[PDB]
Amino acid sequence: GTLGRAFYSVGFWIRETGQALDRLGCRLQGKNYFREQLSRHRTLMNVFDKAPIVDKEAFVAPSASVIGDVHIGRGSSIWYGCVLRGDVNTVSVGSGTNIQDNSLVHVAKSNLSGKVHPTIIGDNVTIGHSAVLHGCTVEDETFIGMGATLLDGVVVEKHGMVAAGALVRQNTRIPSGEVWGGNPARFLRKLTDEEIAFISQSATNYSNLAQAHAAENAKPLNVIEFEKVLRKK
Amino acid sequence: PDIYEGSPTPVTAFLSIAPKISIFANILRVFIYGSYGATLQQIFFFCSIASMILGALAAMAQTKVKRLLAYSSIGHVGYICIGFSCGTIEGIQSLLIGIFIYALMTMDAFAIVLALRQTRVKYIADLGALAKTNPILAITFSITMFSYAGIPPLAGFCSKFYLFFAALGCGAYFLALVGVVTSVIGCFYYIRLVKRMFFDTPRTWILYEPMDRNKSLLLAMTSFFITLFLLYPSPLFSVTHQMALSLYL
Amino acid sequence: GSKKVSDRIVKLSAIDPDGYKQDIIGLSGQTLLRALTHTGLIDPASHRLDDIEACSAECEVQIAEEWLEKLPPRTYDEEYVLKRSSRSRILNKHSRLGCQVVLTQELQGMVVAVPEAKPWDIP
Amino acid sequence: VRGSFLDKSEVTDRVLSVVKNFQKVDPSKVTPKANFQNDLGLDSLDSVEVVMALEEEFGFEIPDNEADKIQSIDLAVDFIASHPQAK
Amino acid sequence: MGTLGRAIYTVGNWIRGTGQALDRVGSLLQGSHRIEEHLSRHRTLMNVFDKSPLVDKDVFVAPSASVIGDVQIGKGSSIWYGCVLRGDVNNISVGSGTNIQDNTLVHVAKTNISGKVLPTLIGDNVTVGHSAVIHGCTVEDDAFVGMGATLLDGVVVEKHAMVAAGSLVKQNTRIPSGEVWGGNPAKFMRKLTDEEIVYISQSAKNYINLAQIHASENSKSFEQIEVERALRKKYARKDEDYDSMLGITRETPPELILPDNVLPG
Amino acid sequence: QVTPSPDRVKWDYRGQRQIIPLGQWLPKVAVDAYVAPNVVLAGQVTVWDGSSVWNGAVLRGDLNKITVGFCSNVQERCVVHAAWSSPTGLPAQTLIDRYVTVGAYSLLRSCTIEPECIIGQHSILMEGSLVETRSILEAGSVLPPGRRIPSGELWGGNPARFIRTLTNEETLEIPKLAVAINHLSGDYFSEFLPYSTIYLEVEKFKKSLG
Amino acid sequence: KVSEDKNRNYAVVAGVVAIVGSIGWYLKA
Ligand SMILES: C/C=C/C(=O)SCCNC(=O)CCNC(=O)[C@H](O)C(C)(C)COP(=O)(O)OP(=O)(O)OC[C@H]1O[C@@H](n2cnc3c(N)ncnc32)[C@H](O)[C@@H]1OP(=O)(O)O
Ligand SMILES: CCCCCCCCCCCC(=O)SCCNC(=O)CCNC(=O)[C@H](O)C(C)(C)COP(=O)(O)O
Ligand SMILES: [Fe+3]
Ligand SMILES: [Zn+2]
């Protein structure tokens, strides 16, 4: 709360002073390594006491951005280039759910247009590449087409499908077993059983793929690349 | 006005303050100390009146910041020379107090001008929407303009207060009337800048680069002096009384 | 898309001080000065606002009488500025302040003469 | 008062005379919208000599880009009436 | 050097220790809530399933790009900031002189729903616009995919064909030569003028030139970055009047001058 | 043939540099502007006072100037580029004026947005297009090259079409949206001290290698 | 192990001398 925020602010003053002192000490020794422009990107970023809570069996790509109060469950996966920003409200991701590359899952930045809705992503959900989820609920075992946009208030009922490139307008409800698509999103047809099987099997295949990518990313950083970057001329 | 505009702005800032201190020291030690008397003071009386009137009108006509400041300085030397005209101990003391306060205020104003010269300020209209783009700078500059206009309890009132004190002391009501009218005119053309920075909604804005540490520190100190001098004015009063006495003893 | 920027484009010809004719482009509803600064015929840095209170005739242009009837008559302030910024303190009948001329569709093809730049950067 | 342009009414007659005075031009086909090549029986060499005569008349140089656009009378007129160096 | 050198070095050690201890104390006062910034773990090129990307010598890969798995990129191509080329379940092939612009996703499929699953093929001299998404489709040579456009599995963009910016090209759709398609769903719009064909070629060549300056900048070392930062500050403004008084002519150092092929003229 | 380089850097410990100068073209960021750590600014890019650029956005000014205005925001994963010239014949710099909200995942290339406009999420503004002041675009809009959004109007669609004229109150609410987003960005600006402490990690990585 | 820049070291000595001298100046007045 307020007292925690005051201690966080005063803490930053002590840290600023200490880091300045370290830079002084390095300057007296004739070192300029602190001037190097290194990336300050954090895979998990806190905004005061709103931090992400990520399950140990969840793959998160290092270049992904998870900011604020974000919950990722077991067996879930946040792929390369994704951004999840729950600060004004919360963002929760169920288990076994894949958020594909360059997807954006965020909440409204301001309450000017009313109260800010949280974003709820259910279980065994597939979110396609470069999809935009904005304060919407996406129930279990649903399919969000790649390049699609879901606006605040939207509900995608279980076994719902949003077609690739679709624009689901604000407060639209997508019923179960329906395929909606286009701009604005409109009912196209019903979901077949083969496609339901594909939904579940695709969520399972991506959990196995996430595991493989997590092992290759956790491999220790190669020293030879470091020495090559260091000794360049 | 022509030299103040045409010179490089730091030259304008320097010429606005130091030569006046030194030439007024000369004027005191030559005239107040020598002894021709009435004519010498009538010279300065008539020139003070002309300076107040002409400075007020010409400043009211200006659209560029540097010219406005030049004409304001002309008007203020008129106000200061009213003190030399009366030829008393309080006249010399008030002349010295007026010089000191005008110098600090001018240093404030030229610190702001040099800060805005990094984005090439030239016209009064260039300051449009400065209260949005840099609100604390617009407040500091508004304080300087109200101090220039003599609005109490800012330091600028002190000098204005004397003008009327001598006018009713040396028995001069035409001087008092000139002071009232020219003070009103000055107030108008100073608050026009506050209107430009706060009340206007221009279509095109100029975004200004932030100032360096030297000017921010000098501005902070001079602004604190301008707002808070009338709370503790004893040292300046005592020291100027000392100087006025030491002219003869 | 039923609404193009070409709907607002105004075609125009400006003659530079060395007498060379150029075809310039501008938007209706914007001043002639904006169209002139697009190509650098007039330095934008010398006249950043479109206000008569920030003008020392750095935007001044000369226009023939045929296009001068298609414009509102010069205001007292405009003539004051032009006359005082003249080196001879003489008001030129074909002079207009480019910041006070708003381009409209009836000014299509208007030809404008751009004189030598006056000095504008005060030390 | 000052001016930068020669009145158009003053320009048309000046271009009208120099073509009439120019040889191979009977002063009867010299309508103010005449083409030196088609309506005046002038070859390309004669047409070049006409723009030259107007340059000297108005005391200013005319660039090659615009020397060619002056193929008719009305065209020569407009150019000079809007050119400020014409005096 | 010397005794004074050693004494100052030792005192600097003490000051550093004090500074880091103060930083630790300040972290404790914050409640340990702030997540510490760490060394970068993003890998520009990565192996997966014993598949390594095959990238030519003269290829710009932005350090922020992700090239993963079985990816082949040919001579003169360029992968820009934020691009993700994930060849983990199938092959991705990029021809020569092809630009994949910022924030673009290129992915493959192991088994499409119906029909023969195919890898992702992008031909020579192809322009792919910003934030496009290419999924299991074929783009032939001298084609143009607009920015924000989306190609689904089985799509074939033919030679000298265009996909308009922001389009959604449905599965198995074939954009024939000479046409531009667009909209959601993508459909025929009009024929491609020859001027637009020239535009496509020029776009590919311009991006080849742009890739050079970006690649040169992104591969500089810390020391060269510092040298050029000092030089840039040195030559940011000028006093040619005082220079003429001194009788000297300050010249822009060559490391701050861009090649003429990227200049607007 | 694809002949690789044995010296190609596969892992860079520094990561992607946020500021990419190009010759003398140095991106210029105001001291009170928020730029997310993984944003890339390259070349002729100016980010003015009170503005904000959020995670994953790319602003590449290698072919023309890019300007983000006073209290304007360029939200997550937007791409702003520019060209040498526009089909309209006007100057082709990308100008995002003051109090402008550019919705996340939007692509801008040589477009002008006049002050106090809202660009919907996932929108596309192409070369030479113009959005006049006090206008709003819906999410998913597509503005083709050289097109124009007239002032005081709400547009949307692919390609964008007129929807309705805005009321006064709706237009008064646009600068409030920009100001609120800047207020939010203040919280993110407050999380970063002037220097990072990565160089210490680099130092111990170097020491643990000799 | 050692700071090499001699001019930097002399400047450091001058700064320390100024600080200690100012402290002594206060302490003896
Ligand atoms: C060297 C540097 C190279 C680069 O980096 S460039 C790569 C990044 N740039 C781009 O991706 C943009 C390239 N240009 C285009 O995509 C463009 O639009 C395009 C290539 C379809 C064509 O755009 P045009 O300006 O030529 O529009 P048209 O008049 O020819 O088409 C008519 C029609 O199409 C529609 N319009 C046209 N363009 C599009 C689209 N795309 N979508 C939707 N709707 C459109 C519109 O409705 C128009 O009117 P309506 O019939 O009333 O609807
Ligand atoms: C001050 C004096 C010093 C300078 C003068 C020096 C001497 C000048 C003479 C030198 C130039 C020549 O003879 S150079 C030779 C000039 N003649 C030719 O070009 C031969 C081909 N003829 C034609 O092209 C046409 O008959 C022609 C009428 C020209 C135009 O075409 P039109 O029929 O479609 O008008
Ligand atoms: Fe003007
Ligand atoms: Zn995929």
> What CATH number should be reported for the domain holding residue E73?
2.160.10.10
| Alpha carbon distance E82, F196 (integer Å) | 23
* CB pair distance less than 8 Å for B66 and C122: yes
Length of chain E measured in residues: 265
Point out the ligand 1 atom lying closest to the alpha carbon of residue E149: 11
Distance C84 CA to ligand 3 centre (A): 13
Length of chain A measured in residues: 233
Chain G residues with CB under 8 Å of E1 CB are: 2, 4, 6
Point out the ligand 2 atom lying closest to the alpha carbon of residue D45: 35
- Is G12 touching A (CB cutoff 8 A)? yes
Q: Is D45 in the pocket of ligand 2 (CB under 6 A)?
A: yes
Residue identified by tokens 């959005």 is: F131
Which protein residues have their CB within 5 A of the ion that is ligand 3?
C 55, 59, 97, 99
The letter for the amino acid at A132 is: V
Buried b vs exposed e over B78-111: b needs ≥16 C-beta within 10 Å? bbbbbbbbbbeebbbbbbbbbbbbbbbbbbbbbb
Domain that holds residue E101: 45-195
Residues with CB under 6 A from ligand 1: C 1; E 127, 129, 146-147, 162, 164-166, 180, 182-183, 189-190, 203, 206-207; F 109, 126, 142, 144-145, 158-159
Distance E108 CA to ligand 4 centre (A): 6
- Three-state DSSP class for residue A196: helix
* Cα atoms in the Cβ-side hemisphere of radius 13 Å centred on A29: 19
**Antiparallel, parallel or unpaired: β C60-63 and F52-53:** unpaired
- Is A29 touching G (CB cutoff 8 A)? yes
Nearest CB partner across the interface for C54, out of B9, B66, B125: B125
Q: Which two tokens stand for residue F156?
A: 């949307």
Q: Which two tokens stand for residue E132?
A: 């496009």
Chain E residues with CB under 8 Å of F56 CB are: 82, 103
Maximum distance among all alpha carbons in chain D?
Answer: 44
- Three-state DSSP class for residue B195: helix
**Antiparallel, parallel or unpaired: β A53-54 and E162-163:** unpaired
Point out the ligand 1 atom lying closest to the alpha carbon of residue F146: 25
Taking phi over 0 as left and psi of -120 to 50 as alpha, with beta for the rest, F77 belongs to: left
**Which H or E run includes G9?**
helix G6-27
Task: Provide CB contacts within 8 A for E185, sequence distance 6+.
Answer: A165, A182, E168, E169, E170
| Alpha carbon distance E123, E95 (integer Å) | 5
| Alpha carbon distance A18, E22 (integer Å) | 5
- Is F121 touching C (CB cutoff 8 A)? no
Which ligand lies nearest to the CA atom of residue A209 in the structure?
Answer: 4
Q: Is D23 in the pocket of ligand 2 (CB under 6 A)?
A: no
* Residue E30 contacts residue A11 (beta carbons within 8 Å): yes
Q: Is D43 in the pocket of ligand 2 (CB under 6 A)?
A: yes
Chain A residues with CB under 8 Å of G12 CB are: 28
Phi, psi of C93 (to 5 degrees): -65, -30
Which ligand lies nearest to the CA atom of residue E132 in the structure?
Answer: 1
Q: Which of D7, D39, D43, D68 is catalytic?
A: D43
Composition of chain F by helix, strand, coil, percent to 5: 15, 30, 55
- List the one residue out of F156, F3, F184 whose CA is nearest residue F76: F184
Solving technique: cryo-EM
CA distances from C111 to C66, C101, D5, D79 (A): 10, 13, 12, 10
Which ligand lies nearest to the CA atom of residue C51 in the structure?
Answer: 3
Nearest-CA distance from C57 to chain F in Å? 24
Give a yes or no: residue A19 inside a domain: no
CA distances from B195 to B7, B145, B184 (A): 28, 11, 16
- List the one residue out of F139, F151, F143 whose CA is nearest residue F114: F151
* Residue F83 contacts residue F101 (beta carbons within 8 Å): no
* CB pair distance less than 8 Å for C54 and B5: no
Point out the ligand 1 atom lying closest to the alpha carbon of residue F127: 12
Binding residues of C for Fe(3+): 47, 55, 59, 99
Domain that holds residue A163: 2-3+6-7+37-218
- Three-state DSSP class for residue D30: coil
Q: D73-82 and D44-58 are packed helices; what angle lies between their axes, rounded to 10 degrees? A: 30
Distance D73 CA to ligand 4 centre (A): 70
Nearest CB partner across the interface for E37, out of A25, A42, A212: A42
* Cα atoms in the Cβ-side hemisphere of radius 13 Å centred on B131: 14
Q: Name which residue sits closest to atom 27 of ligand 2, judged by CA.
A: D45
* Residue F48 contacts residue F67 (beta carbons within 8 Å): yes
| Alpha carbon distance E149, E171 (integer Å) | 13
Q: Which two tokens stand for residue F115?
A: 């002050």
| Alpha carbon distance E52, E71 (integer Å) | 7
Nearest CB partner across the interface for F203, out of A19, A33, A81: A33
Nearest CB partner across the interface for F140, out of A39, A88, A149: A149
| Alpha carbon distance D2, C107 (integer Å) | 24
Task: Provide CB contacts within 8 A for C106, sequence distance 6+.
Answer: C70
| Alpha carbon distance F114, F69 (integer Å) | 10
Q: Which two tokens stand for residue D61?
A: 């140089």
- List the one residue out of A220, A221, A222, A217 whose CA is nearest residue A79: A217
Compare all CA atoms of chain C with the CA of D81 and give the residue at the minimum distance. C64
Domain count, chain A: 1
What is the distance, to the nearest Å, from the Cα of residue B101 to the centroid of all Cα atoms in its chain?
Answer: 7
Chain F residues with CB under 8 Å of A89 CB are: none
* Residue F124 contacts residue F142 (beta carbons within 8 Å): yes
Task: Provide CB contacts within 8 A for E128, sequence distance 6+.
Answer: E98, E99, E100, E101, E104, E122, E134, E139, E145
Maximum distance among all alpha carbons in chain C?
Answer: 52
Is there an interface between D and G (3+ Cβ pairs < 8 A)? no
Distance D58 CA to ligand 2 centre (A): 26
Query: Where are chain D's structural domains?
Result: 3-86
**Is F183 annotated in some ligand binding site?**
no
**Is A106 annotated in some ligand binding site?**
yes
* CB pair distance less than 8 Å for B7 and C123: yes
* CB pair distance less than 8 Å for G2 and E5: yes
Task: Provide CB contacts within 8 A for E171, sequence distance 6+.
Answer: E112, E152, E153, E154, E155
- Three-state DSSP class for residue F84: coil
Q: B65-86 and B89-116 are packed helices; what angle lies between their axes, rounded to 10 degrees? A: 170
* CB pair distance less than 8 Å for F7 and A15: no
Long-range contacts of A43-51 (CB under 8 A, 24+ apart): A43/E41, A44/E35, A45/E35, A45/F191, A46/E33, A46/E34, A46/E35, A46/F191, A47/A87, A47/F187, A47/F188, A47/F191, A48/A4, A48/A5, A48/A8, A48/E33, A48/F187, A49/A4, A49/E31, A49/E33, A50/A86, A50/A87, A51/E33, A51/E35
| Burial grade of B232 (CB within 10 A; 0-12, 13-18, 19 or more) | exposed
Buried b vs exposed e over C48-80: b needs ≥16 C-beta within 10 Å? bbbbbebbbbbbbbbbbeebbeebeebeeebee
Give yes or no: D46 in active site. Answer: no
Q: Is D9 in the pocket of ligand 2 (CB under 6 A)?
A: no
**Antiparallel, parallel or unpaired: β F148-149 and F153-156:** unpaired
Chain F residues with CB under 8 Å of A17 CB are: none
| Alpha carbon distance A13, A15 (integer Å) | 5
Taking residue F162's Cβ as centre, other Cβ atoms within 10 Å add up to 15
Give a yes or no: residue A231 inside a domain: no
State the CATH number of the domain containing residue A65: 2.160.10.10
